[PDB]
Each structure stands twice: as C-alpha cells, then as structure tokens.
Amino acid sequence: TVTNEFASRFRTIVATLANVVNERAVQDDMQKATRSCTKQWLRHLETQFD
Amino acid sequence: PVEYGIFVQRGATYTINAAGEFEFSGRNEKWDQALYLSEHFPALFSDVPLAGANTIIAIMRLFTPQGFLRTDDLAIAANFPRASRNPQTYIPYTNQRGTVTNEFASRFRTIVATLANVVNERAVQDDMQKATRSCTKQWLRHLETQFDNIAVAHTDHLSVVYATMSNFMLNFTNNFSGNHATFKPDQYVITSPEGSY
Amino acid sequence: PVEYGIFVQRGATYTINAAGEFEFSGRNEKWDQALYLSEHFPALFSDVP
Amino acid sequence: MWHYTSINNDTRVALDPKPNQIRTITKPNTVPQLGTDYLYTFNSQRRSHTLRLLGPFQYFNFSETDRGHPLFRLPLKYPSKAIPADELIDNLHSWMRSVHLLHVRSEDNTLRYNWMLGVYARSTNYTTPVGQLVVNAPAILNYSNPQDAFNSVFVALGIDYID
Amino acid sequence: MWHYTSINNDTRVALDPKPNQIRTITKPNTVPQLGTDYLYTFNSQRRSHTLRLLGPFQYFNFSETDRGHPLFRLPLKYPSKAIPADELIDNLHSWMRSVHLLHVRSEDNTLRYNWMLGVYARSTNYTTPVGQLVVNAPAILNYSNPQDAFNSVFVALGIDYIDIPITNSNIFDDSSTPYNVRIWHAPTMTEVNHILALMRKSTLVSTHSSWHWNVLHTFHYRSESDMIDHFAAKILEDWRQKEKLDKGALVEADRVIQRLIPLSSSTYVQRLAAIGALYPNEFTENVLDLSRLSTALLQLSDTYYQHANDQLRRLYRRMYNDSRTLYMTQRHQELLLAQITADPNILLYPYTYIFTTIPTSMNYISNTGQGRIKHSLTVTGATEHDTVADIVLGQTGEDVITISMVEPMSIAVEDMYGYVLDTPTRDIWPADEQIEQKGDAVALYDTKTSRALGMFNNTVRIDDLLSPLLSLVYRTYIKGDTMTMTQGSLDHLTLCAAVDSDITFVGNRMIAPLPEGYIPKPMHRNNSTMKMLSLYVALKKLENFATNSYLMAPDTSIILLGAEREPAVNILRRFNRNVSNVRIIGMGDRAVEPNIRVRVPFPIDKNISADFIICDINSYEDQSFESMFSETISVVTTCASAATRALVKINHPSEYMINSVIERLSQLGGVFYHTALLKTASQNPYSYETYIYITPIAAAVRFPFYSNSAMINRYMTAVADDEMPIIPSIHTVIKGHSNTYSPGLFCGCVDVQSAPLALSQLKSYCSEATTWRVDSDDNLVNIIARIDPARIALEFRTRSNTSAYHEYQRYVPNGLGFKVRKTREFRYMHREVTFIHKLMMYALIREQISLTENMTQVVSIGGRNLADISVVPLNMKYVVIDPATRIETLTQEKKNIEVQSRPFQFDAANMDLENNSIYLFIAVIMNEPNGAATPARMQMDKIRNVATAMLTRTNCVAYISFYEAGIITRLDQSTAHKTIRVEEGRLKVANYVPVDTLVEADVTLMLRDIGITHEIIRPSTPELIDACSNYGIRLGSTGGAVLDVFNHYSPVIKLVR
Amino acid sequence: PMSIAVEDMYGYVLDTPTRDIWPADEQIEQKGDAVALYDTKTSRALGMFNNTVRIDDLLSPLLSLVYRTYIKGDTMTMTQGSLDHLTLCAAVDSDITFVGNRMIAPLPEGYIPKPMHRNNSTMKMLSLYVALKKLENFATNSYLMAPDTSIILLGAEREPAVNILRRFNRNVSNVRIIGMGDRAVEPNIRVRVPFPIDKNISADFIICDINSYEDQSFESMFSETISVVTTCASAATRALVKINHPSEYMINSVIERLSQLGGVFYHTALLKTASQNPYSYETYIYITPIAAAVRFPFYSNSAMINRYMTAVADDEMPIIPSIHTV
C-alpha cells in the first residue's frame, strides 16, 4: 500500500542531486529565474515518475 | 520527506485500546470509506504528540473544529423522536455576539499564516522567483482578511440556523460529538432472530 | 496460516483402521481422483476434532 | 580432565522475546544507556565510528525506509571526531523507538516470537510472501516448538526454503 | 481508635479569593517564584515538560486568545531539554499578569468570589449567557452564602444547568479534557433527590458523595473509558485517606466518602466501583505509578471476586448491580451525621446503604513500584495441600532475564591483594616418610585430580569473576572522577593496571586531568595479571609487612617469570613510573618484547638475577613425573639461588614434591632457607596452585618440611575417581512434592492467577524465590528459584504437605515486584566464606551418618535455626536442643522433629546415654549460650565433659568441632582480613565476636589420657566440590585463598563410642 | 513544620532498668493491667494525635530544604561519618560522592537527581541506626559502619531506610545491608512475622521495627512478639527491637526470657529516639550481651513505659480544634 520504494527512492535521488545542482548553480552565480525553472523541471519527474 | 517518514512510520491509522490509550497499528495501509464505521480512526487526526516529525503534526492542529455542542433543549421537551440516550448536535461556530473581530475569523487568520509560513519554506526550498512567492502569498493573504468579513454574519446569522436545525423533527441521531480524533457514531442495526441483521 | 498449519500436518489424508480409529497419514500430498477408489479419504472432511 | 562437559544453548533460539511484551522491546519510553543498549567507538583509523547494537537487537535488518532516518546520516557528519555522545544517544533512541514489529500478543505462558523471521518481514515492507503472510496473519509468528515455529510458515505458503 | 474524627473542608468553596482584592491575584507586580507559584518538570520521557499551576490558579480555563500567548509555544521549543528556568518564569509571568478577571470590588467583609464560574466567563469571551451575564452585571459574582452564590446566576437567566467545562493540570496539553462538571441548579435537598434520580438517563455522568459550594454538580464523561481514568484515580485516593480514618487521625477532607457514584456507568465502571466500597487493601506506604493506575485497579477486582470468598462473593455481586447506591460503613455513616447535624442544609447524597463492618477479607497487598519481589517461601503454612498438578513455567525469553555462569566478584578493590602464609612445621622429613609420599604423589599425577574440581577452576576464571569491579574503576577514570591516589597506594596500582595510557600525577592525589578530547583504551588483562600483579603486592608487602608504599624501592629491580607475560610486567612500570631505576623483565615462552623469550630448561650461560623474582611458569611437562618433578625442582633451583626473595608457583605440589624442594635448597647452601606458601587472594578461587616463598633467612629455622599444610591438602586430597560432575540444570516443570529434582535453579515463567499456587507448591524445594512482572499488561509472573539441598532434606522429612498458600493468595493481582529491564541471574550465587565452610563440615558428617549400623536419632546439641538438618537421612528424628529455636510445637511435629531449648553442657546431669544416637556438636564450644565467648581454657573443659559423658554410654558418637591455634599466627602474617582478621588473639569469624582458641595437641592429649576413641577429622576437596556443586554456590576470590587455611585449621573431633 | 537544626535530629534517651526483682506477686497484677489496656485500645485522644502528627510532614520542609540547595550546588562540606552527610544523602535519590572529603563531586553537567522518597519511618529507622553506631562507644563522629561489619533491617515496608544506609556507607569495604518484613521489595527478602524455620540470619546489629498488630488479643500477641525479640535477640550482638506497647508487663517479660536463654542475663535499655511521631508510645528495647551481670533488669515506673502505661482510655471523645469566627 501507498507510494512505492522504487518511486520513493527516485524522489530522494532527484533531491540529493538537485541539492547538488543547487551548489553548482549558486556557485556560477546564475539568475534565480533559471535556477528555479530548471529545478522546477527536475521536480516534475520526481512526481512524474511516481 | 523526513517528517512524513518518522510519522507514517508510526501507523497510518490507529484504533483504541480498552483503557482508551491510542493504539496505533503498524503498516501504513491506505484508507477506504467503507472502513469508516469500525474501530479504526484515520491516523493523521490522532493529534498525539510524536517526537520526530513535528512540523507535520503542528500543521495538523489547524483542522480541529470551532463551535461548541449545544444540547437541542427544545426539540427534547417538545418530545421529538431522537433516540440517542441524550440528543445533541454540534454547531460549527459560536455566535460571537460580543465585540470586535471574532474568534472564528481570528482563528483562520493564524491558520492561513502558520500554513503560509509553511508554504514559504517549501517555496524558498525549490528556489522560486520572489515575483510569485509574493503574488501567491498575497493571494493567500486576501482571504485571511477576505474571510474576516464573511465570517462576520456567516457565523452570527448562518449559525443560529443550525442552532435550530440541529433540532428539526425527524432529523434525529448525533452527528459528531466534536472531537475528531475519537468519535465513532452509534451503530444501529435491526437484529432479527430470523434472518441476518 | 496458523490453523492450516496444524491441520495439514495432522495429516492431509487419512484412512479407517480395522476399528474405525482414523489412521491419519502424516504426509500432505495432493489428491488426484486417482485414489477415489482406494482406501484414502480426503482429510478435511474427517470431521474429527 | 577427560569427558568434555558442556551445556548447549541455542542462544538465538532463546533471545527471541515473549510475544505479549514484544512491544516494550523497542523501549518506547526510556532512552538506551550505552552500557547495555549498544556498544560504540571511533577509531584512530582517522574515521571509523562503529556502532554496535548490543541487545535483542543484534540481529536486525532495517529497510529502505529504516535506512533513511538520521543516524545513517549521523555518521557522515563528524568524519573528524567521535559522534557527540548526546546527538548520538538522543538520536538513536528516536529510530529505536520507531521500529514497530507487527504482531498479535497473547496470554499462553509458553509462546515466544521467532522474531528474526519477523524482523525480516518488516525489513522489506511486507511484500515478500513470507512477509505478506504475517501482516494479515500475525499470530503465525508466536510459537512454542522452536522448530514448528518455522515449519508452520512453510507448510502454509508451501516452499523449500526462505532466504 | 473508634469513631472517625474529621474536619470537613470544601477546599474549593474556600479557595475563591475575596472580591475587593481579586485583582492583585494575577500578581501584577512580583514574578511567580517556583516554590509556591507553580510546580514544574521535565521527564526522562525524552520530552514531557509539565507545568503545574499551583495556587488559586489550579482550576482555570484559558481561551482561544489565552491559548495564543507564548508559553504554549514555549514548550515546543526545547523538545530536547528542560525549558530554560529563565525564559520560563520570566515568560509565564507575562501571561499570568495578563488574565484580568472582570469584577466589581466591594467593602462588605463577607463577600467572596465564586471565581471558577467567572474564570470561565472569561474563558470564552463573555458570549455564553452565564458569561454574557457577568460582563455588564459584574456584581452578580460576589456572594456570601456558598450556594446562593450560584442559585443567583440561575434564578436570573433561568436554567436547569450550567456546564463548566473542566481543563486538566499541566497547562501544556491542549489535548481535550476527559470530561466536564455540570452544575445543577437544585437548591433544596428534595429537588436534587430527584435531579440525579432522573439522571439515570444520559450516557455517563457520575458524582461525588458530598459537594463543593454545596451546589449539586455532576460529571459527564466524554467517553466510556475516560470515565475510568477518573474513578480509578479517585477510588484509589479513598483507600488513601480511609487508611487514616481507620487509624484515627483528624482528616480535613473535602468529604468523608471520597468514592464516586457511577451513575449510568457500564460494567467496567460497574465492577470498578464495585470494588471501591470494599477497601480491599493494607496501608501501602509506597506510591502507586499513575497512568497504568487504572488497569492496575480494574485488574484487581477481576481477581478479587475471582478468588472471591463465596459469602462475600455475593456481598460483592450485590453492589455489582445496585450501584447507584453508596456503600459507606457504620463508622463513616456515623460521621456524615455530625455533618448533617451542624446545619441541615448540607445537601449530601440521598440513596445509600450502610454496611455492617464488611464480611472479613484479604489485605490484598499491592503497589506498582519498580522493585521485583524477593520471597522467602515458608516451610509449612496451613492449607493442607491434597496434590494439585505439576506446574509448567514457560520459557524465559532473555531480554527480561538472562542466566549466566558466575555472579561477578563485587568487592572493595583494596582487599583484593591478600594472601596467606602456611608456614612450615615438621622437624624432620625421614626416609620412612619419603617412601610413602613419592608413591602417593606419583599416583595423583598418574590419574589427574578430581574431574569435578578441575572443571571448577576453569569455569570460574578469576578474570571475568573479578572484572566488572575492575571494569568499573576504569569506567569512571575515563570520564574524570578518580582524583585521589597516593602512588604507593594499592588503589593507585589498580586504576593503573586497568587503563592502557600512561597514568600521571602532580602533588600526589590530583591525577593529571585526561588531555583534552582524547581517551585511553581500557587495559587488556590475561586473567593471570591480577594474580601476578597481586603476587608483586604480596612481595613488596612481604618485605616488611607494615607499609603502604608499593613502589619498588629506589634503584632495585625484579624479573617476571610467567609464560605469556605483560601487561603483568607492563603495568608494573607504569605503576613504578617515576621511581629512579627500577628494571623490570619478563621471560617465558610465547612472551613478546619487551620480554626475553626463554624456554623452561633455562639455556646455559644465560645468567639472570634481580632482587625479587616471580616464577609462574613450569606448567605441564609430559614426563609423567620422575622427570616433571625434576624439571621443576630444577626451575626453582635457578629461580632460587639467583635472587634474594622470589615467588615460585609450584604446581601440584603434594606433600612430596613441594617438600623435595625444601631438601634441595637445604644442601645447595648449608644454612637451609626460609620458605612459605603464599596462597594469594586473587587467583582462580579453586586452583590448588601454590607459590612457594623462598628467602635466605640468617637464623636457621629448625623446621622446614610439611605434613598437613592448609595449602597442600587442597591438592593433596581431591584424589579423583569422582564418577562425573553434577552440571547445574534449570528444569522448568515443578512437580508436586516429589524428591526427584536435580541441583540447579528454576527460572520459569508461570501465568499469574496461578503464581500463588505455583509459588506455594514451589516452597517444597528452594527457599527464596525472586519474581517480577514487566508492565501491568503482562499476564505472567516470572519465578526464579534455585533448589537448595537443605530445604529438601527438611520439607520432605516424614511426608505431609501444608503450605502458606492462600496467604500468598494475596499478592496475586499486583504485589509481585514489577521490574522492567533485563535482570541477570547467575547459575552460581555468591556466599560468605564462613557460610560455605560449615556447609562443608556437613558434607563430611552426613556421609558419615550414612555409615554406622543402627543409629536412631540425631541429637543436635546447640543448633540454631536447625542448620544440622541437611545432615541426617529423611528417616531419623532430628532433635535440637537450642534455647532460641522457638518453633510452634505442631509444625515441629508435622516435619517430625523435637525441641529442647534447654541449655546445659555438663555431665552427671546430661542424659546423652540415648545410644544409637549421634550428637552433632558443631560450634557450641565457642560462644556461651548468651551469645558471648567461652574463654579458651574453659572451652577446653566442655570437651573434657562430653568425654567423661560419652565415656559412660554406648553406640553414640559425638561430633565436636573446635578452632586449633595455628590459624592465629598464620593469620597475623597473611593479609586477607576478609572475614577472619585476628583481633588480639581471637578471630571475628564474620559476625561473631572474637573467639580465643585452643591447642590441637592438648585436645588430643586430654581425651587420649581418658581413652575415648577419636579422629580429628577435617573436611576435604572432594567434599568441598560436592558441598558446593549441588548448591549453586561458587567460592569467590578471597574465600578460596583463605578457605583452604580456615577449613584445615578448623578441625573436627569424632568421639566415637 | 518542624524547623530545627538537622544535627540535633538523631537524639534519643536510655531509660535504664531499675528493679532488683520482678516477683510473682507483681506478675499477678501486671498481666491483668496490661491485658486490660489491650482489651480496650489506649486513649482515643492520644492515638488521634500520633497519626495527625506524622514525624514525616512535621519534619519535612527542613529536610526538603537540605535537598533543595544541593540540587543547585550549595552544599560543599560534609565529612562522610558526619550526621550532616547522612542527611543530605537520605534526602537525595542519586549517588552522593566525594574527593578529599568536604568537597562533594559537583553535580554532573546538565542533570538532576530526584529528591529522595521517605516513608515517615525512614527518618526514624535511619535515626535508630545513628543511635546504634553511637551506642557502640558514644564519643565518636564517624557514622560509617566499621570496616567489614554488617546489619540487617527489620521493618516491614523497608527501603529507602536500607537503601540510604548503603549510599551513605558507600566506599567502606564490606558492609552488608539487608531488609526483611512483609510487603518489602528487593533488594529485600520478604519474610513474615513468625520467622520461617531453617532460615538462619545474624549480622552484628539488627533493627526490628516489625511486629505491628497480631489479632490474637494478647496472650498470643504477647507471645508472637516475645518470640520476635527472641530470634532478633540471640542472633546478633546488638540490636534494636521496637516493642510496641509495652506495658510494665510485656516489655518486662522480655527481660525474664533472655534471662534464661542464656544464664548471665542481658543488658537492655529503652531507646526513645528523637525523630519518631512526637507521641507514639512505642519504645525500642536495646539489647546486648554485657559481660558483668547487671543485678537489676526489670522495671517499675520507667519514663518510657508510663507514656503507654497510663493513657488508660475512656476519654469520652477528642476536642477537635475549631475556628469560630464570631
């Protein structure tokens, strides 16, 4: 019942990674316009592959 | 993620012990409506302190109801058919015929915030433009104030209606005691030595 | 599970001893009709406690 | 002298808790005192903070979920020096008090618990049949004959071996 | 005494402040001092910070607004630890000073305030009519007649009842309210009569016997069960004050009968209140653990009516139904009358039913503390058992109870390095003797000593045995707690032996604080280290006795001879670290540097010497004597010449090989030597290994050689041919009164409700069973018993079988310990060496009493609690002549025995002549009947008397045991004041007042001149293992080291006719 | 509430025996007088008083205060054998410590011991123990059970009485402490009044505070206890036995009994201990095997005995303190 372990795993994978993409991005001082649009995109398949 | 893990970890639905403590179950089982009548309250509402995931529990306090529960009074002396040892209903919200603001609109005001504060963390979390954090927070904000005005007469005037409806003739039975985390209706069944009840 | 644990184990098929006392086999083989005409009875219906 | 003289034991066979109180086992109230509730260290191996689960918990399993909860993040935080006694106990205790072994308490003064098998049904989320067995049928785990314990499991879902 | 005498109160009625100053109440200026302004805590429940509002504020209400203000956010901020005293008080005070109770001060010197009602008008924001009343009309609240107070409110807004919701203590718990009190506007007694009469409707309401403000109000339970938290708390409180009334003690209570009337209960509450009236208890004195307090109480009734009583089983099935009634009790009743008398306006509860002293009972002992209950099973009760089936204790599921091999040492570190010198005594070792000794000694080696004894030294390794104590020394130091030593201090040496890192100092005492964030690794001992380390203490000490500086002099060294050396050697340097030149070395095969690695037959050309040497090697030489004897005679030779004082572990030794060493040093140096046998305190309890102490004295000795020696007999006997060991078992199936049982404990889990009976039938084997419940939801007790081969000799004697049974019937529900946390039980108890000793004297005597043709009764002359019992077949009568035995004559005859509590000890008026009798004279000729000390000269005359006495009788054997002198000099040198010591020529044998002793020779010479056949018999190792093995007992360090000597010296005389 | 200097709290009194002989003529009158009191139950007024005035609450806030400061680091000077040391200890649950005496190991970081839980019998028993060590040789201020000598506590519902003694005697080599009495929880054997045969116990000084009520209605109740003191008596060198009653009869009967179960009499005293429900006419006999006869024993008046000797009863109710306000 409820969620998975597989989709649930991908969920934390997208994040740990995403968190990683975040450091690199704030690192190469980038507009928040795209840090977000793209993080937003990364986010769609967390749920999307759920 | 973390909160919904320590917490759903501790049973997704509890039932109640004999000494009335709360016995949560183990699995995080889903929850069907046909499972509504039978020792098994949904677990989110248990409203029982849970060491770990506390943000989830706190967000939870928002759901508890406002109004008190009046005991029909009138319908009873009139003799109206109730059938529930002692009839009574629960009114959504006290008619605050006093002064300034409310307690109901005033409550929603802190509810929008605690929540809004919560929306804020999630948003700064998924690094979003301040253009929308704001436009949307702004929107969240319009009904804090916006439902301030509606609840004025809604609660005074809309409430008294229940005040009476709570007691219409046939319109018996107790619907809700007022305590989400522990109110299971009275199961009435027609028993029959003959066939199956 | 718990009950069809001790039950299949008591024996999954039995036979009637010279004095009725049911002789309960300890195996739990299936039950092809191939032995409907033998001396074995499906065990469930033993109707014995 | 001559003839060896021993007293066999079957430690594990007798380390599985009685069922009726296989709840307080996770120690829900009190917090795990290092003495007899776990062994622990940090070695001059630059890093190497080993946490030994002394108690009825020795043999356990975890999960994908059990493996999320900090304490498994709590090691990779003090790479430099021994985890802060405090942040450790306090913490550990949180998880400890989380594991909720599915079961059906009884009254018979001889049942036990098999545990291990169970602990494992919990490991994976109750999907691996043996596991999908206990869930709805929890009583299956109590048992009196150290061996019948298992033979029950098999007999029902019918299999040569469980891993 | 009789009539209860109280002073009613109506607390609340008199806790409502005077109106004119019902403002300073919120304390606007000063800040709330924890003392009397609130109670507070944070519990090891991880979190649980409870804030108790002590004061006129107890009963309050809050709001939706009151519930905003921090303090209700102030709890969920320090989830981890107790709120910061500061942030708490300071804070709280803010709110405190906020609540502004609407009112209209006055001047009348009688008004009050009702408060509660008001407090509540404030709760909600003055909307609920009663509340909408006070606002504009505030004066309504002041009042003078405690009841008119309210009746005013009602009269005006006209209503049957006002509901006062009722909060809960601990302002930190917005989690609902169990129930709520309803105030019933029922003035005259008649009115109420009927209010609550109709109240047998509506689900659950309940009320108290009397009433606050004297205005009938009732409780309404939000739930069927919540109803039980309340009753339980309250019915229980009743026995709390009721114990006092029975006792006769002014009890200012709110109302006599504290219980509370289940009006509409529902079975559970039905049977709960059912019990209530019965006061089934005994003034506890303890404190019952709340929370599970309900289940505890609800459970007790199930068992009370359950063991019930037939008659009173009904008396209770009665109140089980007619429950809306109240069951006072004559006394109570009489009191309530004083009350009604005072002013016929006290409108107390209508329907009731006086009792009539209640039909007897059972003081159902109880308490829900945390200890586990140690019971001491009685021999014979009075429930004449028919038979009743054999009980089946379940399986002890470790994590509750684990069973282990040897009750860890637990002793004061300082007494741990104590030995004994068995000094040589044997003017000459003639060839005639050599002829017999070599053969006896070779014979033992040919076979290998008792299988039973050897199994024992190995299982009982002075390592683990004495570890946790040592582990503890180390455990504290690692955390900065050991701040006082003294270098030479034994205590200093021990912490040191225990910790790897380098121990330090400053101006002594102060030990250089552990360097920052670093930690030393607790030392690694071999189980030979404490022994060797200890031998070293024995040596420095042996140097001149009187001294406490154990730091190897200035530039003097020693070498360690023990195969597999270090830390033994290593600990010595860390210990002797600062002292000028001290050189330490360690040989022995398998020894790792810093340690030379020689091999037994010392390689020629390799010359070594060093003040004091310690040789612990030698161990096993295939040779099978002749040569093994020679290989070692050889080891001691080098170890001997090369050094001034040294220890050599001679293992065996026999009166032969150990003695041979003496003759050898005798010639490799004319003027003999001075040797001693150092039995060292720490050293595998048993292990008959003895270290000879050798030194070149400069005054001859004219003695050397040995005969008995406390040390030698230890290995001299133990002949072997034991016919296997008696492994301690653990059977868990209690049979009804049947001898069969093999030595070992009963660790079992019996289901409760049966515990009474199991425990009751269980008394027939062991004689002290410990037990516990883990939680109040564990319907199984845990029994632990260890069959005690003495109780059996006693319970079984002349069949029968009556146990105290019903009396234990009382604990059943609750009084059965209650621990919750792994216990440890050892398959081997510990025991004061003195106790193990007479226990041993018995194993020689019982076997004897089982070897003499016809023998009719055992006359135990001076027993005391009848010890001698387990030393007589389950056939003969046992007759104790003991002044203070005090046994009921009937119980005395039930287990067939006789008591003459008539002290004598003089012939001519001593009817010993009853032939075919055995006189057991243990002790007695020690301390006068008056628990004194029979002066040695006089102690002798008693033996002289039984002698002339035994002399004119027949077929009687008298067992007299005395204390020969050798123990005193040996003791003065040895230093193991464990339980012997030697106060000015005597010896406080444990708890006994010193006891001057006598000459073994004078004893022999007097009876010898007289002619009575005798044997001075002293126990042996065969008997020791036997005495101990069937007893779960172990020996424990100090004991072994000193028990050898004490057993040997403390001989016995068989005056046989 | 009490309010007194802790140190003066462990003080008793020895009413010493004085009565060359206890003739049968006297026995005739005493047994009846004594039986009569038991037949009725002493003064309703007096009894009501011991219970209301429990030496617990009465003497608590002073004791509560000792504990209140220590929890916050203010008690930095003791002396082990010190009475003062024993009291702070009896008062605090956790393990009291030391260093070079005086300095008490500072409370470990952010932790707090739970203030002790006394029975209202503990201060009394704890105090009796002080009386015993002190009775050993009077002049001395080292109240730490010698080197390897032990005592056993005989009071039903024991501990912390026994427990406080070990924490107090915690460091001293071998001191063994035990506590019997029904309803006693481990570490405490749980025997019952008429000591179960075969169970042999002794231990330097024993303290017996049990006995309390025996339905027997004398003859036997007198005998059940005469019996209690007998074991308590032979088995030990010095021990306290709470004899409750005692009358000039029963207390005296105990004297005649020890008189013969050992020729050279005994030496007994009546220890009225400072702390102990102000009233409560309960007296502990002190018994020891003196080695010089005594040629006196037996009693006549005794300050201790009259306390319960009179109080005849037949009081005609108590005078409850009122509070009239007019």
Side-chain angles (χ1 to χ4, degrees), chain E residues 818-872:
Chain E
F818 236 96
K819 181 194 292 180
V820 171
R821 174 189 38 49
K822 201 211 306 167
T823 60
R824 263 285 183 170
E825 255 60 1
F826 309 101
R827 201 163 297 184
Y828 282 114
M829 304 309 297
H830 184 305
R831 278 303 147 58
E832 53 292 299
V833 177
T834 60
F835 164 53
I836 303 180
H837 176 234
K838 74 254 300 180
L839 209 176
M840 184 159 61
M841 292 179 105
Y842 290 150
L844 95 57
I845 302 181
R846 133 201 306 170
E847 273 183 0
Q848 221 63 359
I849 294 176
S850 200
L851 273 186
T852 53
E853 299 180 300
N854 55 76
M855 49 217 134
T856 60
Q857 62 180 359
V858 177
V859 178
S860 60
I861 184 180
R864 190 92 309 107
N865 233 300
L866 54 57
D868 306 359
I869 195 65
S870 60
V871 179
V872 72

Side-chain angles (χ1 to χ4, degrees), chain B residues 86-115:
Chain B
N86 60 170
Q88 37 111 359
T89 60
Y90 180 92
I91 304 300
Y93 31 31
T94 304
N95 176 181
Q96 59 51 280
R97 78 297 159 285
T99 64
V100 183
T101 65
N102 290 74
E103 272 300 1
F104 179 64
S106 60
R107 143 62 123 205
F108 174 71
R109 177 156 308 157
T110 61
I111 183 180
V112 177
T114 301
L115 205 176

Side-chain angles (χ1 to χ4, degrees), chain E residues 250 282 284 807 865 930 991, chain F residues 157 183 192 199 203-204 262:
Chain E
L250 300 303
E282 195 178 302
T284 181
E807 309 180 0
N865 233 300
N930 272 303
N991 184 199
Chain F
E157 313 171 304
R183 184 162 59 273
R192 270 224 298 284
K199 176 177 206 58
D204 300 299

Side-chain angles (χ1 to χ4, degrees), chain E residues 834 838 861-864 881-884 903-905 921-940 942-943 960-963 986-998 1046 1050, chain F residues 200 202 233-237 260-266 289-291:
Chain E
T834 60
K838 74 254 300 180
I861 184 180
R864 190 92 309 107
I881 302 180
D882 302 1
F904 35 15
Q905 204 64 299
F921 260 105
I922 302 300
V924 180
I925 317 186
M926 288 286 121
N927 355 285
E928 293 180 300
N930 272 303
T934 57
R937 173 175 313 170
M938 290 336 284
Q939 194 180 1
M940 210 298 292
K942 283 184 195 61
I943 303 180
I960 303 180
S961 60
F962 63 81
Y963 290 161
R986 282 192 163 198
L987 44 163
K988 301 100 64 190
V989 188
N991 184 199
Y992 270 111
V993 165
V995 185
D996 297 299
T997 58
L998 42 42
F1046 185 176
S1050 180
Chain F
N200 203 66
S202 59
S234 48
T237 22
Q260 35 66 13
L261 96 59
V264 195
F265 264 119
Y266 265 97
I290 185 64

Side-chain angles (χ1 to χ4, degrees), chain E residues 769-814:
Chain E
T770 180
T771 180
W772 9 282
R773 267 154 65 76
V774 177
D775 301 299
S776 304
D777 300 300
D778 182 299
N779 328 255
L780 301 82
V781 177
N782 299 359
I783 303 60
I784 302 180
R786 124 199 334 297
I787 295 189
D788 300 300
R791 199 68 155 53
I792 303 180
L794 187 297
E795 179 297 352
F796 279 113
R797 156 65 110 306
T798 63
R799 207 192 89 294
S800 168
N801 184 54
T802 67
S803 61
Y805 187 140
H806 185 253
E807 309 180 0
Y808 311 86
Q809 249 300 0
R810 311 194 305 172
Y811 316 144
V812 182
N814 293 286

Side-chain angles (χ1 to χ4, degrees), chain E residues 1 5 247-250 282-285 371-374 376 807 864-865 886-887 930 977-978 991, chain F residues 44 48 51-52 148 157 174 183 185-186 190 192 197-200 203-204 230 257 262-265:
Chain E
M1 224 307 265
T5 68
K247 306 295 301 71
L250 300 303
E282 195 178 302
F283 45 97
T284 181
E285 294 298 62
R372 36 194 184 60
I373 302 180
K374 212 176 136 55
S376 193
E807 309 180 0
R864 190 92 309 107
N865 233 300
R886 309 299 179 179
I887 286 183
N930 272 303
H977 48 37
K978 190 61 277 307
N991 184 199
Chain F
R44 170 49 195 167
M48 195 211 40
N51 307 359
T52 60
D148 317 359
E157 313 171 304
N174 306 301
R183 184 162 59 273
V185 186
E186 174 282 304
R190 163 176 297 193
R192 270 224 298 284
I197 306 73
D198 184 293
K199 176 177 206 58
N200 203 66
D204 300 299
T230 301
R257 151 143 320 150
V264 195
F265 264 119

